[model samples]
Target: KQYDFTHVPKRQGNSIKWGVLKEKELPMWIAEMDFKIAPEIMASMEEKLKVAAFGYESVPAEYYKAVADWEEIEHRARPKEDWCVFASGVVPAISAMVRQFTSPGDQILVQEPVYNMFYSVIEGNGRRVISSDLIYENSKYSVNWADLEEKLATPSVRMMVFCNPHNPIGYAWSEEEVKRIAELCAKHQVLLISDEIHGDLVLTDEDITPAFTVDWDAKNWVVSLISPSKTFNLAALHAACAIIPNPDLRARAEESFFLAGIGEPNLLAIPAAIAAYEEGHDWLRELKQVLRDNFAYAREFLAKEVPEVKVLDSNASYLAWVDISALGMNAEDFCKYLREKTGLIISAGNGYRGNGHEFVRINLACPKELVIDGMQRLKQGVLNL
Candidate 1:
């Protein structure tokens, strides 16, 4: 079964990934996939445009059903349809929830070396951000449970944003691990918000353990901030879902969403997401296969050609967390050297906090040819060093 994995369509419009970079540079730092969106999703958007009216869209029952069905079929968990809320986007709703659910002087907890936006939304909304840094041992990232529980026990820490199958690091927490996190938050009387945006990208035998399905008291239940953004490359689509199992908690979310004025979906958001969840099944697996191939190529190439930089064999998202510590330089210096010498633009993990200073994150979701080019550029940069 062959798909168009070799060629890439040039971005005719100004993509942030392309626009911000210098001429002839290969851009791979940003989260968006370089691959095209699934045709099923694109077809639905095109059909929506034929309506001739572009305005507010009420999320139909089918929208929630599709999300539930997708979870049950793909992730092996089924959340109640009523538990779903039509959110404009994950981070936007998070920002709203931070403002409405949390208060001044209250701190939000996160596992650092996490998504940079978590820090942004927390601080941007006047709340303090705290991190129980994940311990890195034997080339693996594990939660420091004692540190995590202690931080949550604090009186002013009200919310915790979790990253299952964490970005950059791309580690998927086990079912037991996810449940333990939920229980700890419940014990501390703190709210848990799980960002499972990278849930669909696991390339291993183990499926992502959805935080909403964790066995926890509804009183201290988790809020799942999920989206098609990361999975289907729908970042510009702005369609996300907020799943809260408790009525009281969901009600608060509704109020917050109302105050933030973002309950309504954009015209194409519903159709596109519906198409993605319902018809995007085969396409998703194919995409993951592509990612797996790219990841293998890069890892093998780096190991043989540039032994100083070692790529962590991650089973989650397409993002590669690379340890360049052997190069005798920090992440920023290595990234600068790479860009200047080889025009290969990747991310310096410094912004992700924790032990990110020693690592550089590369985007391995592109075509295999580009992966080869990136590997070649990386080798050239190292040779120059």
Candidate 2:
């Protein structure tokens, strides 16, 4: 079916990200899309709606097949059906794992400026966050392997949260990168939690390697979390899967989900996920093209109209990380000024930690017209400063 990526859906009061905005404000902060979900996904949910009332349901074997098949087709790898476990969402699962696998006062390692929520998940449970910040040079981000290994070797650090295709900075980790990180984790005996939610959204020929697909020695140390929530805009579905290659680790992860009360899925989550994994491939292909065009336009607009701003080069994720250091304001202040003066809303990079204070993330998963509007507003906001 032909999908429309050009028109913005009316989400005035229907979306948390859109509904909270003031009448004139444009929201490009949250990692949500303005375009409608795929028709195939909608049809699947509609099929479930045929029943009058919903009831508790168990995850079926077919659901596992859909996930495994999707991975094989899209990412050149697959998790065995027996290795899959359901969870309410990625963050919830992370929090649960933090509580179960690590003890209070232990250090949970992460690469910063990563998905900000990872900080809350670690610290909220009384675990300290130990970040080996990604090195930023020449408009690109890379891991400082020596520092990462040194930190991981610390006996107090029991777990490391890995953003496979990283957020904010938007670097998709290479297979070699993934394997090396996995090896380090194994050598240090750290539980490697790989958050691969954006795995299917890489915009180029570069493929994101799933943690479970790493070399045999590293597989036992990996826990790969994925979901259709970001892939198909099914965030509210509160559904995600954890691929644990090792049986012992898999059992522990499953118990963590159960203890945290997030092991079950809402009635619609399974069918919606099944449809997204089984039939949403073509729609995703089209979505990526629109995202590419939006990124190109935004990049060019900043180069010409907002010359002081520097948009980072990203190979994956729809979020654009732009350096605002030349603007002379910290990211939080810059975002506040833009919102108050120009009615444009975007995320302050500081929330992601590290050099995030000098950057801001712009969501580009919207209609082309809105992308233009947002960029123009961004230009005006910076010019006003």
Candidate 3:
């Protein structure tokens, strides 16, 4: 691969990507890729550090424009610059949405098994988590519209924290699906907080649609969370933007940010975000090809080596949701078994939305060799079991 993603920077000792694997022998849980942040991005950050100064600042207009321009070029949706809100990251934005929009004791609808933090944040904010489980169809995952509508129609469901190009499962909701979700939320008057953080890093060989600027009723009930952290390896505490189109929601998020004492972009994150959207397209293109190839290799490798484990190819995202229900072990136990025996540390399926308990998430963002090693560990782990 042109990117040469096989580099093992974690050998330097104590990396978050490998931190979870410390002394355990394997590290595969975090979504962070083993790939280096694109050299262009590093150069940009390096130049910025030349004059780096820690200071309180308002979100720069160019920061929003960076995201807007990037969305237009890549996802084909150019959001109004005013609609964006800068945050520390996606989950913080999600938590801010819970504080800003929903009422105490109100129900926030989330699709499970999903990003586990969604459940915690909703519940942590004193809101209820109402699940609309996705249906596994033809070995791929699809939203159950009926269940979705039913859940949205409920009086208690005040907001929805949606995961676009969903995590763990890696299902990219289509434009048609996005419209359906928007229509449902619009009808029920529920606030839709679409989390599209994974949208930019999609594995699609073709263009993928984004949910924030999708043609839907934007009468002030929809918001979106996006970031470059995952794709660019800037995940260790940087800036993320929350796009809140609704005037009421904008005010609410603004107020919540103020009250919570969270403020504007860090000196480091601002340039990174700008350069990522402005100068990182070539890097992203290469990364996508590598990820696509990695996924293909994984699927083929599994087909020959471990037919018992089902690997479903998602339309986007780096997560490979492997179905292990047939293996007749709980997802956590399966992870423990893998850890104890083969030292392969994949994400436990149940740790995602409960829908994932019968499966495990493989981080395919790494090099083909590491993935192959992970698969080898997987084969040995299972056969030994």
Candidate 4:
């Protein structure tokens, strides 16, 4: 049976990501396709069904307490109630932060070949993006600290935005790396903005280190943005939080997001998040196991059948950055051929903007059948060439 990907910009739909494609298009890009929400989250959404039509309300105290409880239990970082600022989306929260914290045209720092949208948030709000592009060598990327500090210390750059358990590349930064980053940014008097939206997607035995958890400053000057959207297929819900430890900074975030119209939760927002952070732990554990299995399957399948593509391992998230340099074509053209010939649409590496031109991103957060199907399509796409 086919799934519906059609409901689109008509208000609500997956069209912005996986929907709005040609009917036969099989998108191996974006996030979820067949992965369903946990029973807890499903049941929680039904509570919204009891609503007598939606009405506006401030995010409840129960919701923030639940967020803190979940963080302490899950990540060992128990941030306070005032620290959690509700927002329409993590994307928007970061947008408000970028605009409010930095002057127009101030250079905002990022490590590129990252989620292209980190770029969109900075430049979208009329700021300049200065990348301390990661040093990708021998299959893994390591931060060039000297370069990172140079940009962080730059008088023109005041905001240092980071993606943890980062995207496209799928490498989760170590605790030491995160601490070092926090130290330098703060030393330079730069505000550290950590996007931990993917913080929960880690598939490793070693847990992720939230910036708030790191021993940076007594104040812990960071705004750690997080959400259950990616974890529970609740992206459309647009519910996320800004975890800020400093009181002065927290006030700014609350106000910025408020003025931007992102501080309030939609009717279903509070319940969905409450249920996710509270009751969805076991489901998330099982979900990671499947993701780990999918990653193993993808690497195995690609190496055995399409040796033309080199598969890289990711300790974090379900995204695999498959190297296509062996095929002797830019990732964009390779992706175009695959989409045209096999109808398998994926994220091309060039869109990530650094050494990304040589790779393609395969989101492993789908059913095993689709993973197998995507691999077969990729093989055929390569064979046809």
What lDDT is reached at residue 239 by model 1? 92
* Cα lDDT of model 3 by residue, 143-170, tens digit: 7888889989999899888888788778
- The candidate that achieves the highest TM-score relative to the unseen native structure: 2
Could you tell me the TM-score of candidate 1? 0.97
Q: Local error of candidate 3 at 110, Å?
A: 0.8
Off by over 4 Å in 1: 218-220
Candidate that beats the other on lDDT, 1 or 3, i.e. the better one: 1
TM-score per candidate: 0.97, 0.98, 0.94, 0.94
Local error of candidate 3 at 345, Å? 0.4
Question: Mind sharing the TM-score for model 4?
Answer: 0.94
Error of 2 at 162 (Å): 0.4
Q: Each model's C-alpha lDDT? A: 0.88, 0.92, 0.80, 0.83
Error of 1 at 333 (Å): 2.1
256 in model 3: Cα distance from truth in Å?
1.5
Per-residue lDDT of model 4, residues 354-374, tens digit only: 889999998777777778888
Residue 160 lDDT (model 4)? 82
lDDT of 3 at 72: 92
lDDT of 2 by residue, 145-169 (tens): 9999999999999999999899988
Task: List pairs with backbone clashes in candidate 2.
Answer: none
Candidate 3 whole-model C-alpha lDDT, 0 to 1: 0.80
Under the 3 Å rule for N, CA and C atoms, how many clashes does model 4 have?
0
User: What are the RMSD figures for all models against the true structure?
Assistant: 1.3, 1.1, 1.9, 3.4
